[PDB]
């Protein structure tokens with residue numbers, strides 16, 4: 001069974017602090033680094049057990065993950081069982097129809113050896129922890145890049161930068177989570193390496209870890225808002241209400257969290273707020289042909305592209321359990337400043353903001369990489385539809401900088417096509433392995 005005392009907390013619980021820092025480092029002296037990894041990092045790594053208890057949240061929650069080159073630097077030559085992780089995200093960029101020439105330069109390579117995730121309710125406490133780490137490790141650790149992130153303010157807390165409530169939908173791990181209505185239920189080994197029904201044999205010290213896909217995804221918020229107004233479907237409501245409908249058609253949920261599949265023509269903010277109801281759907285509706293009906297939710301909507309539910313078979317009534325092996329745990333957090341008055345008034349981004357994307361899975365080829373390449377970026381996914389060309393995911397779908405053709409968004413005519421500029425721009429990232437806590441002061445410090 002699942003040993004949550006040994007699993008790093010961000011994987012299954014999230015840090016649930018107002019502020020986070022992603023501190024990307026190189027290891028310069030493995031002997032000194034190992035000594036301090038065991039003495040200074042391991043004792044303050046937050047576990048799932050610790051973060052699951054309202055009364056044991058630390059002042060600074062800390063997790064740590066290593067890239068392939070970081071494990072090599074530590075003398076760990078084992079095969080962790082993941083070719084994508086071993087090769088690094090830069091080499092995978094073409095799989096997503098993007099180029100590393102657009103990336104943060106530090107990500108366009110394999111010089112990054114790991115990431116420390118620090119989380120606290122204030123940045124001052126994060127900075128103090130960083131200063132301590134740099135003091136005790138000396139030059140054996142070196143900062144190559146960092147990204148600060150924060151929960152958004154006020155009534156946008158928990159929403160991403162486009163304004164949509166985020167963090168609603170996650171896989172439930174059988175035997176660990178109590179499933180919510182409509183939630184997929186998966187074996188622990190989909191997320192945790194070496195856990196139940198992970199088919200890939202792992203090094204013994206790596207049991208209890210997970211692969212972390214980090215993505216710095218810039219969001220063009222004023223441009224997105226203006227696009228919705230400019231393309232809003234005709235109807236009797238206000239222009240902004242119709243623009244909001246188009247945005248909800250693109251995501252698959254209203255900004256409140258209400259799923260369009262259950263409320264297709266107007267928001268239901270009470271539904272969006274209710275975790276017992278807001279995920280209780282499969283995309284099937286009796287009396288409608290699943291292969292052609294886009295009146296409830298477009299086939300191209302973001303959440304339908306990333307968790308297809310009945311589009312990949314299984315139960316037509318909730319819970320649908322299809323494609324459990326393609327599940328990911330998400331712990332992303334927004335970054336950058338809030339949109340300023342001048343940016344909104346000019347419909348133009350002038351500062352970088354977006355999502356610090358964090359996806360956890362036991363197999364990169366089945367999780368993040370698969371969702372991006374085989375589903376979101378695939379104009380013929382989901383399969384078996386009419387028209388067969390679904391188009392790309394309007395939120396994350398990529399085609400080498402081209403405008404994306406996205407079909408089915410307009411309720412009055414499912415054959416109507418839109419050519420949509422990117423509103424999310426990748427600045428790159430890296431693939432890491434978040435080890436079990438025992439490996440931090442154990443194998444990795446040996």
Ligand code: HEM
Nearest residue numbers: 160164165166167168169217303306307355368371372424
């Ligand atoms: C800036 C980029 C992104 C934005 C703005 C975004 C936004 C959202 C929103 C608003 C939701 C609905 C809330 C929820 O169901 O929890 C969602 C769900 C989801 N997103 Fe994205 N997301 C982004 C990137 C990604 C990427 C890169 C992936 C994977 C390749 C991804 C995978 C998912 C999944 C799996 C779900 C849950 C689907 C379900 O279980 O029904 N997202 N996202």
